[PDB]
Each structure stands twice: as structure tokens, then as C-alpha cells.
Design a protein around this nucleic acid. Structure first.
Length: 310
DNA sequence: AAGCTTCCGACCCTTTTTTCGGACGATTTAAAAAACCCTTATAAATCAGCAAGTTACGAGACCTCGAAAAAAGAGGGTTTCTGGCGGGAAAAACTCAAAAAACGCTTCGAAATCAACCGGTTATAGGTTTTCGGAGCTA
């Protein structure tokens, strides 16, 4: 249930959170034996209330006493609906509320306005993304066994070439387009491996074939996971690195990018070819995300870029 | 002392909850009615297989009504495909005009010519092979 070992983030489902006798208690079908009792309550913990759960104001009081962030997310924890805002660590605020302020916003803003540094960040994002493609498509054979048998030499050549291109070109405007070309080739490779036939990527949900729908669902979950990552870091969604400065919710899409083609896309084609239900697809996606430590990776990346930007 | 405003008691009426009583059902117990047993030698039933005559139970059919399901009919709405009409821009006819350019006069003497047949010229109809442009695709 520990959703991110890097963030001390826990997912609670099928239980009520209430305060009896001055201690926050979980009313669950397992009673005393539920693992929720092992939840450490400290300023380092952060909760994610899941499906079928409710919380009492008294609990909110006790958690605030202990300084524990709370957030509501849907099935499996991908769509993050609402959460507590996290503080910002600077010398002029200084409340004693015992809430672990986080300093990453200052680091982010310290460079966000300098375009050259912003570009350097974009490059760093894409380096990470490609290396996660090469990892999941080649190094690990779980997909191979599942049925996603694809050629390697063509994929390796394409990825090598795109990586070679990343280290070049002057502005965001090229990077976006280079990624788009890589995207197209990856789609073609996946369709060939899946024997799905010809594939064309419609957008704004105009597609009707299973592949398109499953891609949309997968991307929706990925966005939710990224939103969780940013919220844990406290960075507002508007300070995008690679998407346009006017794009509402740009940053989450920047962060979501580092898994779409690594983990969502193959599963979308696999499930479409296998003829799965939408529910089966959702469960498979969440299982893949859990297996890959996705949230932890996207946390590590954001921290790495912050430290590297100095 | 008077007027205004606010409680308070008395009451009137209907609805909602509780209590009690009565009735009905069910069960138990006791009393009454039907029944069982014990004495029978003699009269009637038991049964053997088949014939000859009859029918109580089963099957088939149809009707009757009622209800259920399905199909049709109605109405609410949204999306899109087409047609008609209106409006701006370009083309080409229409109107206005000049300046060439041709024609005629008009050429006696200089080419132009056709005819058949050879070799030779070369524009190009037709076919063959190939860059340029665009397909969009993808973030």
C-alpha cells in the first residue's frame, strides 16, 4: 500500500478514518489486523484517501496536530482530486505549524525565467524519457513474455538517432517536433509488433478503435500520477519546462511525458489486441505503473533537475 | 394614568402515539363418539385361462379469456447535409479609338510551279523513366 517509498505516501481504501479516544482509528473489514495500523503518523507521512472511504473532521484535527498532508484520489490512486497545499520554505515565512515546508519551488523559480536554463531542463527531461523507453522496451522482457515482441535493431537505431538529435537544435520549437517524429515512429513500431495493422493517432478523443480509447485512458491515468508527483513537490502546475508557457496545466503534461511511451503505449496496444475490457485495461495499467516505480521515478527526476539547474 | 408590547392561562380542534380490550387463531386438555376385542360352525369368497361384452382414464381437439410481449406509433432532441440566396472579385464581352497594316491601283520581267523518283532531314507522337510536390504525421 506504500504508494511511493520516496515520499512516504500511503493509499487507503475500503475504510473509514475516525478518531476514538483521541487516536485516529481505521474502521475496516479486517479490524485489528489491517495493515493501516502500521501507518506512521508524523510530519513525514502523507495520506491518499482512495475509493470507498470517508474521514471525520476530528481526524482532520488530529492529523493537523501531527502535520500530515491529506489528499483524495480515485481508484488505484491515479486521478488526484483534492489535497492540502504544501508550504514553501523561505526566510520570511516562519510559522511553527509543524508541517515540513518544501524548498523546491524556490529552486524552480530561481531558473524558470532564464530561457537558456529552461531549455537545458527540457533537454534533461527528454534524456530521461528516452532512456526509459530503451529500458522498458528492451532491457526488461516482461513485455516480451506478455506478447509485445518487437524488433530491437530498428528501435535502438531510432532511439540512438533521436538522442543524438536532442543534444542539438536551438530552441524548444525543435525539441517538440523531434519528439513528435520519434512518437510517430514508435507508434508504427508498436503497431507492427502487435499486428494491429495500420494505426493513425487521432486526438481530442475522436477515435473509435480500441487502441485510441485505451491510449486516452492510459494518458489520463499518467496525468493523474504526475499531478500527485508535483503536489508532493509543491510545484504549481503552471511552471512548465517543455510545454508552452501559456498552457493551462503544462507542467503535469511535461512530467506525464516520461512514462506515456514507456509504460502506457505498449499496454494500450497489448490490451486492444487481447480484446480486454476497459476495466481490465485500467487494472493492467495500474499494475504496470506499480511495477515500474513510476511515481518515484518522476519524483527523482524533478528533484534531479532542480539540483542540476543550480 | 394611558397606550403599547409581551407573556401567560384558558380554550378549541385535529392528528399521532400508546394502551387497552376484543376477536381470532392456535394449542392443549378433557370429554364424547366411533371403534376394537372376545367368544363362532356355517355361508360365502378365493382363483386357477380364456371367451364375450363394457368402460374409466387418456388423448385430441377447440374455445375462452386473460395477460404478456412485441411491434408499431408518437414525441423529444441533436447533428449534418443540401439548397437557395446574397455578396465581392475577376473575366470577357461591350463600347470607344488610333495606328498602323493591308489592299488596290498594277505591274513585264523574275520566281513558282508541279509532275516521279532517289536519297536524306527531323519534328514529334508515342512511350518510358524519373524529381517535385504533397500526403499529411507527430509533439
Amino acid at each position: 500500500i506504500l504508494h511511493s517509498k520516496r515520499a512516504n505516501l500511503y493509499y487507503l481504501q475500503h475504510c473509514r478514518v475516525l478518531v476514538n479516544g483521541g487516536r485516529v482509528e481505521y474502521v475496516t473489514d479486517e479490524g485489528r489486523h489491517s495493515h493501516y495500523w502500521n501507518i506512521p503518523i508524523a510530519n513525514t507521512t502523507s495520506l491518499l484517501l482512495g475509493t470507498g472511504t470517508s474521514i471525520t473532521q476530528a481526524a482532520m484535527r488530529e492529523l493537523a496536530r501531527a502535520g500530515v498532508l491529506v489528499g483524495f484520489c480515485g481508484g488505484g490512486g491515479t486521478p488526484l482530486f483534492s489535497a492540502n497545499e504544501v508550504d514553501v520554505e523561505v526566510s520570511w515565512l516562519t510559522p511553527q505549524s509543524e508541517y515540513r515546508p518544501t524548498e523546491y519551488l524556490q529552486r524552480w523559480v530561481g531558473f524558470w525565467f532564464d530561457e537558456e536554463k529552461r531549455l537545458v531542463a527540457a533537454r534533461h527531461f527528454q534524456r530521461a524519457r528516452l532512456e526509459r523507453i530503451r529500458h522498458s522496451w528492451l532491457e526488461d522482457r516482461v513485455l516480451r513474455d506478455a506478447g509485445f515482441a518487437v524488433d530491437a535493431t530498428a528501435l535502438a537505431v531510432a532511439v540512438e538517432d533521436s538522442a543524438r538529435a536532442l543534444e542539438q537544435a536551438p530552441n524548444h520549437e525543435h525539441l517538440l517536433t523531434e519528439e513528435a517524429r520519434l512518437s510517430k515512429r514508435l507508434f508504427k513500431l508498436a503497431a507492427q509488433a502487435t499486428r494491429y495493422g495500420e494505426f493513425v493517432r487521432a486526438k481530442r478523443g475522436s477515435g473509435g478503435d480500441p487502441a485510441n480509447r485505451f491510449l486516452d485512458h492510459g494518458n489520463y491515468l499518467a496525468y493523474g500520477l504526475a499531478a500527485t508527483a508535483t503536489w508532493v513537490l509543491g510545484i504549481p502546475h503552471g511552471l512548465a519546462v517543455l510545454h508552452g508557457k501559456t498552457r493551462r496545466g503544462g507542467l503535469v503534461f511535461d512530467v506525464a511525458d516520461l512514462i506515456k511511451d514507456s509504460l502506457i503505449l505498449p499496454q494500450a496496444f497489448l490490451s486492444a489486441m487481447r480484446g480486454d475490457e476497459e476495466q481490465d485495461f485500467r487494472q493492467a495499467c495500474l499494475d504496470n505503473l506499480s511495477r515500474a516505480q513510476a511515481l518515484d521515478f518522476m519524483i527523482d527526476t524533478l528533484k534531479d533537475v532542480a539540483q542540476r539547474s543550480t
